[PDB]
Amino acid sequence: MKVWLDGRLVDEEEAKVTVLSPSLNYGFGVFEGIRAYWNGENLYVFRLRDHMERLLRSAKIIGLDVPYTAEELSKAVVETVRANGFKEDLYIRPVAYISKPQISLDVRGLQASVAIAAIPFGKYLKVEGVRAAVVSWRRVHTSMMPVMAKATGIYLNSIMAAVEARARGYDEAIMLNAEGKVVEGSGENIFIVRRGVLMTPPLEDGILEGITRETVISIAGDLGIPLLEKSITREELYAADEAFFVGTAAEITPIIEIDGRVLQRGPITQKIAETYRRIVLGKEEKYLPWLTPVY
Amino acid sequence: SMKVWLDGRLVDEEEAKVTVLSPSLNYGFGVFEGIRAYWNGENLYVFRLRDHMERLLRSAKIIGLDVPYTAEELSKAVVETVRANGFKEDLYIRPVAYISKPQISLDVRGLQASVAIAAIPFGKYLKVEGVRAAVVSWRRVHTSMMPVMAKATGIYLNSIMAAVEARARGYDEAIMLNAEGKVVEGSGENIFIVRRGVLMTPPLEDGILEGITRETVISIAGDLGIPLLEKSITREELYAADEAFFVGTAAEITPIIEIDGRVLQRGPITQKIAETYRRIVLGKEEKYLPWLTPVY
Amino acid sequence: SMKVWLDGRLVDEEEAKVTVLSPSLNYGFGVFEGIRAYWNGENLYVFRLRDHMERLLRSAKIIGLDVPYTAEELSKAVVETVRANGFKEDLYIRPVAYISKPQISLDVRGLQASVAIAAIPFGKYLKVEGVRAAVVSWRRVHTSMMPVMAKATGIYLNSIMAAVEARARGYDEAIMLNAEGKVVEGSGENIFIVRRGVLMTPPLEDGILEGITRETVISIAGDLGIPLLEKSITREELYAADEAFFVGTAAEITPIIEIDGRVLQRGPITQKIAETYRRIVLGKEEKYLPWLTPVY
Amino acid sequence: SMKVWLDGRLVDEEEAKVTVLSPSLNYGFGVFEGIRAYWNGENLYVFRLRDHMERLLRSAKIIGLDVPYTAEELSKAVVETVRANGFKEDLYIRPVAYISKPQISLDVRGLQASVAIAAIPFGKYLKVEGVRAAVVSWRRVHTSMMPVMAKATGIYLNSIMAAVEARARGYDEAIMLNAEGKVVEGSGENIFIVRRGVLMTPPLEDGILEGITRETVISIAGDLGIPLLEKSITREELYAADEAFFVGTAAEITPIIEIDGRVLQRGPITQKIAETYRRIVLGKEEKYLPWLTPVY
Amino acid sequence: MKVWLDGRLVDEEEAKVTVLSPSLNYGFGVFEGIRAYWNGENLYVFRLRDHMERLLRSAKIIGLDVPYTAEELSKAVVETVRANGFKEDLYIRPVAYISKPQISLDVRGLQASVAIAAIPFGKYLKVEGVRAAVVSWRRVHTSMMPVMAKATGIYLNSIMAAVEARARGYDEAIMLNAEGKVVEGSGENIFIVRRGVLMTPPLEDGILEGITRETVISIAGDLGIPLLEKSITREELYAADEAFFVGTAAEITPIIEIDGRVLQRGPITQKIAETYRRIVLGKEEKYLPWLTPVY
Amino acid sequence: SMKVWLDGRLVDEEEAKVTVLSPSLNYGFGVFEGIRAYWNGENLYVFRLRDHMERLLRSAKIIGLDVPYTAEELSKAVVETVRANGFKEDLYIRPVAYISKPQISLDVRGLQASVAIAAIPFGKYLKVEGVRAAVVSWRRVHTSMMPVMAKATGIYLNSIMAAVEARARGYDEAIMLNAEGKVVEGSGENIFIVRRGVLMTPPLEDGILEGITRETVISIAGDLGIPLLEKSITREELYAADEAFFVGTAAEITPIIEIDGRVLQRGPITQKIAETYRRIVLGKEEKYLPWLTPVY
Ligand SMILES: *Cc1c(COP(=O)(O)O)cnc(C)c1O
Ligand SMILES: *Cc1c(COP(=O)(O)O)cnc(C)c1O
Ligand SMILES: *Cc1c(COP(=O)(O)O)cnc(C)c1O
Ligand SMILES: *Cc1c(COP(=O)(O)O)cnc(C)c1O
Ligand SMILES: *Cc1c(COP(=O)(O)O)cnc(C)c1O
Ligand SMILES: *Cc1c(COP(=O)(O)O)cnc(C)c1O
């Protein structure tokens, strides 16, 4: 019920933007998604700095001036959670946007506001596995929108995918890029396992560089699971020994069906999903530097 | 401070606001319109009001947004909005349809849109005497990725990249090529060239938004005996053009007097079409008076 | 059993078989056709027989398949197959041209095709009252990679991908975009929209098979005074259409009442085209009697 | 005559036929394989049988074809077909999976495939000393349109287009670029170049079929210490290569000595890979004895 | 043996450019091809002004400054032919290029030279019909080079096509554009006949706007042959009742074979080829305004 | 006035000229090189001379030009050329291979190239302290249209469009994206970014020319313990880069201190690599002395 907004905690109901904002009207903003986990002993924010660092990278990429440092945004999160006394699982949404009414597309020199909402949050995707479908919509291409930024207007594309998959009776979309390579869910990175090797599409194929994908790559290297950042085709998805989605909201979600073709809820996925939970729960000493305690 | 219509009710512009958690703000899921009203001394006339509100609702059906108002209801809303502020001068009117619920999930199914209508004084968006335009590096977003024929909010991040690129680098406005490298639009305007006495404008299928100012030019070209072809334009046809201009609601009819440093005359067809458009919007052409909604 | 024509002989349908090592089976090097015959109560009329057989032959020359029969021969062979079976009811007739020799090598030069022609009882392919369609993830196979204008066997793996994708979700049919992102085909049907009183169909160049039902529809539109444009269609124009329908030999004229959840009316143009097509194929339009081949 | 396996029965090759109305014939909905057996003087060894049968099954699941046999079953069925025929010489074995039911409809869901397996005497597919290749006008069919990694029947119309184009001019084989312009395939072969001591082959994602000869070559390179990169190949890198060769079950290891008139040496890497492959398939490499299935 | 060069007639051997010219080194020039026909009574230059007008349009498109008007270039042609006393069929090559040595790619402000050579010339293509082949090379695309200009560096693409077709045992190439639509020969526009309707690809498909194509469109309209400027696919080429190439050098050349598929030497082509010859020969009064007499 | 080598003979630069009818001038059919020599006080050293001349000949084989000289002969020619002018200062050397015959026909088969070599004093092509770069509207020409890995003359019309666009609009240099919109080159330079301590440069397959200055940077990065990845770069990775630089023979190692108005530090890796390159070319690193051809 308290939300941070430009350096102040305000009630939920005052964290609002004019309807003439070019952020609303032109998809001109950036956002982030950050989890905090309650383990019974504390509340820990997962990879806080890395997210706020990417928030600012996203802004720089789309030419939005965010007048806060990653440290002051990081501090604001913790202060936003303390203000509300939350001792439970949360999703945290920072969003950067223009506060002023403006009809002109010329946004040079404008200065973003940032708001930080923390809300109680369970599971995005079914933990025992989802049914996925390749959609008709392709991922917006680097030549038209800067897709490595988590920029707000891009997610129209993501919405068309998420809705198509869902109206068609599946749990989540898979999007192919302009060249036809599997790249992303609607908000998720994607991993396959092919003969004991983990594959995820490289930065250049049009993906957003996920922090949960990054954690997955570290987990792999700890576990000695050979991993490649390599383009994935539909056919390799269809023929996968295992497949899974990753993201802040999704966590580690097995994909047990692609376009009607059943996939094993496999062992590589289970080992990653298990170790990711131990990590966020603060049960792996080595990865404690990524947990920010709130109390 | 102005009154703004918001879901049926007139509120101060300071109250026409939406939660920062709205999937509209966060994920560019909304639609919008641009509509002018013109003061002619006698009355305030809103231009092609019904056509714009029908487009709002087509935009919305294209992106799967549920707007719970009719075109007639929206059109009345604009009239009530301008009146309650007693404006008697030129206005730009912005209808914006968006989700006023906080929602983190991308699954926007089932949600019903809000609609705000702001009417503001305004203004010429472009230099009447003409603009210098650049072909930008950024490609116009493609139909296979976003439904670009909707005036949908998220798509404009593409326009912004364009508009900033042109301006930052010296120019007044961008020209964007499609994925197949044909000329398609400005950043918020449709484009016309005149080649050998023939008007050319990119067709619907190339990636444009179907402009109402575009449509009006096509009617004007017919009144005036100027041949018109909805036909793909290449960057070479731009460079060689005898005349070029932008059109749109804010833009009106704006001559392009330079493309990538190559100079264009402010030409006779452009001026004829600009001149007629002004007659039309000011209520001086009988035939077009059903396009004008009087406010008072 | 029922008799089937195979290389100039009427054989029982159990003998109408081809070695499993044919390069037509193993590499999709064949052509086919789809032809209907309709019983009007007096006689059984085969609809545009010669046009279908001419097109089989164009399909072959396109792919380099050597069909040792003329259009006229194949046309007569149909008429005898129907007669042999004593059919007095609506049929779908399938001419299939393919290699009867076993051959592992991809070098199919100089081989000579066989032709088999089967006539089968057949009602409707899609719901008469209208079908729900989904734009699929599969794009239409591109001209740069196979000769899509030919009705060629190996191409239809793409059509099956699309057809199954749509039906696996309980939609009735697929719509497929071409590589450039424009609507082109159902899995086995040409597509028409109505948009502001104008009938639009993707043009030849977009990657369609040149349907003969399509061609009929184009003649009927002229007869009826309906303005018609062969122009690229986007997904946005489909979503926003006033009406939409599929056409094909098996499909006839089927209204599209849903596309990606967006409802479309079963419209007046589609109805009037459906009703006129029906009267043509039953012999009730005297100008079209030349398209109707009597069997008895 | 020679015996062929058809659905768990050894039949004479004249009975190994399929109705001409199968959707496998009419719509290219099938999968196949190519497997060799080699006579070394002591025994006939089938080369990587189980890997080929595993891949048949992956090909089917990719296309949604229901093959009611396991890899192991099909593997044994091969061994019996060879034995039935008393062959004691080099063979090409063709497993073909396809629908034995007649069906006009594109909805192939839930149908159950038949499998036929033929074993035929077979020498060389391409000149041992090297072949002249042409980059063809036809591009490899794209993943967005068919599932190229599957060895699926309907895809090979594209391969025939390419194969015929090259051979019509008296070249021995085709090279095909993918949609993005990168070298991917011969008509029926994977491609390798040597460029400055490094063996390069297009990668999985580029649109290739994952050849088992390709996979062997990759194991042999590791054995031999030859640095290997799976990276996209341009036409320029082919023209400029130190060496080039095609690989495939039928092709074995064939040097490419001419591409678009540009001469290439019959090189040392290609020779050493060819010689090692030969020794592997004859049972003279003890580490690879697990890839060799004895028939007798 | 006399050639015009920057306002002077010089012998063939002095019409030369430094090897360090950025025109030679970077394909930065424009050119034209113009015929003159000897009819026994005079020598007439076909559509001289229209060609010199396009020369200048080409330069303007690639940003080459040509300091002559179309009229002065037109005059120079006639003066170049008179100087040589030619009374026979000629091809005329105007080429505009940079005279200065320069390694920098920055050609702004440079000022072209123009040279005008007139040479005796027979037939480019076999008058009774050619065998054509679709090539592996695609026409350079409008997004990379301004292909509506007859600019010199572009013709590398054309060369790769012409050579491929020719090394493969055919008479001429057919090039498909980036989208796969038939657009051009290596130096020729292309026409098909489909059920009595003439089709040629539109300006936008990547073609150069040929003057011989334009004459063909006028001839069609005189003859009441219905004509469409419409995209052509390979399949429509394969299934054509007739096909032909047009260009200054090619004239009207039937295409009697495409990729092994025989085409009729048809009647629409013959009527156009016949009327084009009557035209250039000065036997059609109506089209006399396009012939410039030399004597 | 300088002596220039021309087909084996030394002539005054005024005589190193070619007919205006040459298919090289008219149709961009030729190849070229850029090579430096560096005065170090002790001698004049030509840098990577043999490597550049081998590239000339690869360029030529790629475009089908017949250059009738060996790499060794060309390399000697450069040495003889610099000597005959007695230069003892920094030079740019331009070899250019072209057709000295007048030929109107595009069929260039059978013709033999001439080669001229000019050696000229020069010069820094770019601001040592750094350049401002723009992403241009023009796409880098594609492999499916021209053999862009050849340093072929006609391709540069693309570079010129780029270079003029950047410069005309304020900037020092262009950056061009490929057809697939990945970052590929400057107008005559290869590009490097530094992201999180890692050097990145677009790989061979994306459309670059394989620069010798590029190769030298890859060797330098190895000497210096700086990790390097030949890997596609997106415009977002450019914008976010910690450092960026151009490399090429004329360019040397040029920092990029602005990309599309976004400011970059003149960074530490760039400076380290620039510094080493200068040591290398001036004969101060023993290991690289086989790269230096002494003139005297
Ligand atoms: C946010 C996002 C992801 C997931 O990233 P995390 O940092 O792991 O939450 C994946 N793909 C896209 C398109 C996204 O926007
Ligand atoms: C709104 C808009 C136009 C202009 O439409 P009008 O109806 O004339 O105001 C043109 N192009 C784009 C991209 C637009 O959003
Ligand atoms: C056969 C076919 C049609 C319809 O053609 P008709 O002759 O009208 O039956 C349409 N599309 C495709 C892809 C086809 O194969
Ligand atoms: C079968 C095939 C190959 C070669 O695969 P192998 O298993 O090595 O015989 C290569 N390319 C394509 C297109 C194929 O169909
Ligand atoms: C010159 C040219 C033509 C033919 O034009 P004409 O003006 O008829 O000589 C056709 N195509 C291209 C690519 C050309 O350069
Ligand atoms: C010549 C060239 C370079 C630089 O090559 P160097 O061998 O380093 O001089 C880079 N890019 C392009 C396009 C070039 O022509």
CATH 3.30.470.10 residue ranges of chain C are 1-123
Which of A138, A177, A203 should be substituted to probe chain F, the one whose Cβ sees the most F Cβ atoms within 10 Å? A203
* Residue A111, Ramachandran bin (φ over 0: left; ψ between -120 and 50: alpha; else beta): left
In three-state secondary structure terms, B278 is helix
Rounded to the nearest angstrom, the gap between the alpha carbon of residue C75 and the centroid of all alpha carbons in its chain is 17
Q: Measured from the CA of B52, which atom of ligand 2 is nearest?
A: 7
- Note whether F170 contacts B169, CB cutoff 8 Å: yes
Say if strands B183-185 and B173-177 run parallel, antiparallel, or are unpaired. Answer: antiparallel
Alpha-carbon distances of D134 from B150, C105, D31, rounded to whole Å: 46, 18, 27
What distances in angstroms separate CA D80 from CA D3, D15, D46, D114, F48, one per listed residue?
A: 10, 18, 12, 17, 64
Please, is F83 exposed, middle or buried when counting C-beta atoms within 10 Å of its C-beta (0-12, 13-18, 19+)? middle
Rg (CA), chain F: 19
- At residue B28, the 3 state secondary structure works out as coil
Which residue in the set D106, D153, D187 is minimally distant from C159, CB to CB?
A: D106
Alpha-carbon distance of D54 to D33, in angstroms, equals 10
Of the listed C151, C231, C272, C284, which one is catalytic?
Answer: C151
Q: Which of A176, A166, A246, A185 is nearest to A210 (CA)?
A: A246
User: Binding-site residues of D, please?
Assistant: 52, 55, 156, 212-213, 249
Residue A288 three-state SS? helix
Contact with chain C for residue A259, Cβ under 8 A: yes
Return the number of CB contacts < 8 Å for A and B: 202
Question: CA F133 to CA F261: how far, in whole Å?
Answer: 8
> At D17, is the secondary structure helix, strand, or coil?
strand
- Would you state the torsion angle of the CA atoms of residues F204, F209, F212, F213, taken in this order, to the nearest 10 degrees? -100
Dihedrals φ, ψ of B66, to 5°?
A: -95, 105
C81 CB less than 6 Å from ligand 3? no
The CB-side HSE value for F163 (13 A sphere, CA atoms) comes to: 19
| Whole-angstrom distance, CA of residue A45 vs CA of residue A37 | 6
The angle subtended at Cα E182 by Cα C156 and Cα F159, nearest 5°, is 115
- Cα A210 from chain centre: 6
Residue whose CB lies within 8 A of the most ligand 2 atoms, among B46, B140, B141, B151, for a mutation test: B151
Residue located nearest, by CA, to atom 12 of ligand 2: B188
Catalytic residue among F151, F182, F272, F287: F151
Cβ proximity of E103 and E141 under 8 Å? no
Q: Return the CATH class of domain E1-122.
A: alpha beta
C-alpha D208/C-alpha D149 separation (Å) is 6
Q: Are C255 and C129 in contact (CB under 8 A)?
A: yes
Residues making up the binding site of A for pyridoxal 5'-phosphate? 51, 54, 155, 211-212, 248
- In this structure, the residue with its CA closest to atom 12 of ligand 4 is D188
A158: chain B residues, CB-CB within 8 Å: 27, 106
Regarding beta strands D252-259 and D131-135, do their DSSP bridges make them parallel or antiparallel, or are they unpaired?
parallel
Q: C199 alpha carbon to ligand 3 midpoint, in Å? A: 19
Give the C-alpha separation, F248 to F190, whole Å: 6
How many Cβ atoms are within 10 Å of B222's Cβ, its own excluded? 11
A21 CB burial (10 A radius; 0-12, 13-18, 19+) = buried
SS (H, E, C) chain F: CCEEEECCEEEEHHHCEEECCCHHHHHCCCEECCEEEEECCCCEEEECHHHHHHHHHHHHHHHCCECCCCHHHHHHHHHHHHHHCCCCCCEEEEEEEECCCCCCCCCCCCCECEEEEEEEECCCCCCCCCEEEEECCCCCCCCCCCCCCCCEHHHHHHHHHHHHHHHHCCCCEEEEECCCCCEEECCCCEEEEEECCEEEECCHHHCCCCCHHHHHHHHHHHHHCCCEEECCECHHHHHCCCEEEEEECCCEEEEEEEECCEECCCCHHHHHHHHHHHHHHCCCCHHHHHHEEECC
Touch test A–D: 3 Cβ pairs or more under 8 Å: yes
How buried is residue C227: exposed, middle or buried, by Cβ count under 10 Å (0-12/13-18/19+)?
A: exposed
For ligand 5, atom 14: residue with the closest CA: E187
Is D64 in Cβ contact with A260 (below 8 Å)? yes
Residue D208's closest CA among D238, D248, D262, D259?
D248
**SS3 of residue D246 by DSSP:** strand
Kindly state the DSSP code that residue A124 receives in the 8-state scheme: S
Six-digit token pair at A180? 């036809």
- Approach to solving: X-ray
Give residue E16's region: left, alpha or beta (phi > 0; psi -120 to 50).
Answer: beta
Round the CA-based radius of gyration of chain A to a whole number and report it. Answer: 19
In the beta sheet, which residues pair with residue F119? F93
Q: Is the dihedral of CA F260, F264, F269, F273 positive or negative?
A: positive
How far apart CA F212 and CA F249 sit, in angstroms, is 8
Query: Residue C150 in contact with residue C63, Cβ under 8 Å?
Result: yes
Q: Is C103 on the interface with B (CB under 8 A)?
A: no
Spatial contact of C141 and C153, defined as CB atoms under 8 Å apart: no
Q: Please name which of F205, F215, F236 lies closest in space to residue F140, comparing C-alpha atoms.
A: F205
Class (C level, CATH) for E123-283: alpha beta
The encoded tokens of residue F19 equal: 């007919």
Distance of CA E189 to the CA centre of its chain: 8
How many alpha carbons lie under 13 Å from residue A274 in its C-beta half-sphere?
Answer: 7
Neighbour subunits, E (≥3 Cβ pairs < 8 A): B, C, D, F
CB-CB neighbours of F292 under 10 Å: 21
Integer distance in angstroms from the first to the last C-alpha of chain B? 21
A151 close to A63: Cβ distance less than 8 angstroms: no
- Chains C vs F: touching, with 3+ CB pairs under 8 Å? no
- Asked if residues B247 and B213 have their Cβ atoms less than 8 Å apart, the reply is yes
Q: Is E189 in the pocket of ligand 5 (CB under 6 A)?
A: yes
Contacts of F137 in chain B (CB under 8 A): 134-137, 177
Distance between Cα C17 and ligand 3 center (Å): 25
Q: How far are the Cα atoms of B90, B181, F211, F265 from residue F37, in angstroms, in the given order?
A: 68, 42, 17, 30
Is the shortest distance between the CB of C189 and ligand 3 below 6 Å? yes
Question: What gap in Å lies between CA A162 and CA A137, rounded to an integer?
Answer: 10
**How far is it, in rounded angstroms, from Cα C248 to Cα C185?**
10
Q: The domain D124-284: what is its CATH number?
A: 3.20.10.10
What residue's CA is closest to ligand 4, atom 10? D189
Rounded Cα distance, C170 and A81, in Å: 46
Residue limits of CATH 3.20.10.10 in chain D: 124-284
Please give the angle made by the CA atoms of E14, E15 and E16, to the nearest 5 degrees. 95
The nearest CA of chain C is from the CA of E179 a distance in Å of 8
Query: Which residues are CB-neighbours of F268 under 8 A, at least 6 positions away?
Result: F243
- Residue F177's beta-bridge partner residues? F183
Residue (of C216, C194, C190, C193) closest to C204 by Cα position: C190
Scan for tokens 């070298």, then name that residue. Answer: D183
Give the CA distances from residue E184 to residues E147, E206, E235, in Å, rounded to whole numbers and listed in that order.
11, 8, 15
Residues of B in contact with F260 (CB under 8 A): 165, 168
Question: How far does the CA of residue F186 sit from the closest CA of chain A (Å)?
Answer: 17
Q: Quote the CA–CA distance of E191 and E212 in Å, as a whole number.
A: 11
**Long-range CB contacts (within 8 A, 24+) of B81-87:** B81/B3, B81/B4, B81/B5, B81/B10, B81/B117, B81/B118, B81/B119, B82/B37, B82/B44, B82/B46, B82/B119, B82/B295, B83/B295, B83/B296, B84/B3, B84/B10, B85/B2, B85/B3, B85/B119, B87/B37, B87/B44, B87/B119, B87/B121, B87/B295
The dihedrals phi and psi of A144, each to the nearest 5 degrees, come to -115, -35
Q: State whether residue E108 sits within 8 Å of chain B by CB.
A: no
Tell me how far the alpha carbon of residue B248 lies from the centroid of ligand 2, in angstroms.
5
Neighbours of D110 (CB within 10 A): 7
Asked whether the beta carbons of residue F260 and residue B134 sit closer than 8 angstroms, the reply is no
DSSP state of A104: S
- CA-based nearest residue to C49, from C117, C126, C112: C117
Residue with tokens 């007096």: C42
Listed in sequence order, the residues at least 6 apart from A30 whose beta carbon sits closer than 8 Å to its beta carbon are A55, A58, A59, A62, A64, A66, A95, A96, A112, A149, A150, A151, A152
Q: Is B268 helix (H, G, I), strand (E, B) or coil?
A: helix
Contacts of A72 (CB under 8 A, 6+ apart): none
| Closest CB from A63, A91, A153 relative to B164 | A63
Distance CA D106, CA F16 (A): 69
Among all chains, which residue has been given the structure tokens 């570290």?
A218
Question: In Å, what is the CA distance from F15 to each residue of E26, E97, F26, F68, F102?
Answer: 20, 18, 20, 21, 17
A239 to D62: CB separation less than 8 angstroms, yes or no: yes
| Cβ–Cβ below 8 Å for A259 and C168 | yes
- Kindly state if the Cβ of B213 falls inside 6 Å of ligand 2: yes
Rg (alpha carbons) of chain D, rounded to whole number: 19
Rounded CA separation A279/D176 (Å): 48
B262 at the E interface (CB within 8 A)? yes
Residues 6+ apart with CB under 8 A from E40: none
CA of B183 to the centre of ligand 2 (A): 15
Length of chain F: 296
Residues of chain E with CATH 3.30.470.10: 1-122
> CB neighbours of F115 closer than 8 A, spacing ≥ 6?
F5, F6, F7, F67, F69, F74, F77, F95, F96, F97, F98
Active site residue C284: no
Q: CA-CA distance, F99 to F106, in Å (whole number)?
A: 12
> Rounded CA gap, C70 and C68, in Å?
7
* List of residues 6+ apart from E83 with CB closer than 8 A: E2, E9
**DSSP states along C100-149:** -S---SS--TT-B-EEEEEEEE---SS-TT-EEEEE-SSPPPPTTTS-TT
Q: Across the strands, what pairs with B243?
A: B194
Given a contact cutoff of 8 angstroms between Cβ atoms, the answer to whether B169 and F169 are in contact is yes
The alpha carbon of residue D7 and the mean position of all alpha carbons in its chain are separated, in whole angstroms, by 23
Q: E178 touching B, CB under 8 A?
A: yes
Closest CA to D95 of D55, D62, D45: D55
Give the architecture (CATH level 2) of B1-123.
Answer: 2-Layer Sandwich (3.30)
Contact list, F169 vs chain B (CB under 8 Å): 134, 169-170
Nearest-angstrom CA–CA distance, E193 and C138: 33
What's the burial of D269, exposed, middle or buried (CB within 10 Å: 0-12/13-18/19+)? buried
Closest to A52 measured CA to CA, from A2, A4, A122: A4
CB contact burial C197-214 (16+ within 10 A = b; e otherwise): eebbbbbbbbbbbbbbbb
Rounded to an integer, what distance in angstroms lies between the CA atom of residue B132 and that of residue B257?
Answer: 6
| A233 near D CB under 8 A | yes
Contacts of D136 in chain E (CB under 8 A): 136
